[PDB]
Design a protein around this nucleic acid. Sequence first.
DNA 1: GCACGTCTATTATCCTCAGCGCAATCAGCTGTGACTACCT
Length: 56
Amino acid sequence: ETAAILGYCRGEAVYSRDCVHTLHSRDTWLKKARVVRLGEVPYKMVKGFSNRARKA
DNA sequence: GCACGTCTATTATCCTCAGCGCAATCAGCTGTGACTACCT
């Protein structure tokens, strides 16, 4: 989050492209033979694309 | 910058199987009338 700001376009800060990182869901970790520890707060919250969420 | 045509999607609902008791079905017997042939 402390990445240097290259500039401002119409008030919006422009960041470097090589700063994008991804994560995985609990089901994805399960496929990777890993189990999420109980009580852990999820690190990132994003709008999911699952059919159950899509119907909701 | 805005609206239209197009490509694609991280778990739900609906037509068909399984032992007993009641009703449907046939076999056998009889009635009712006539038809018909042989013998006394």
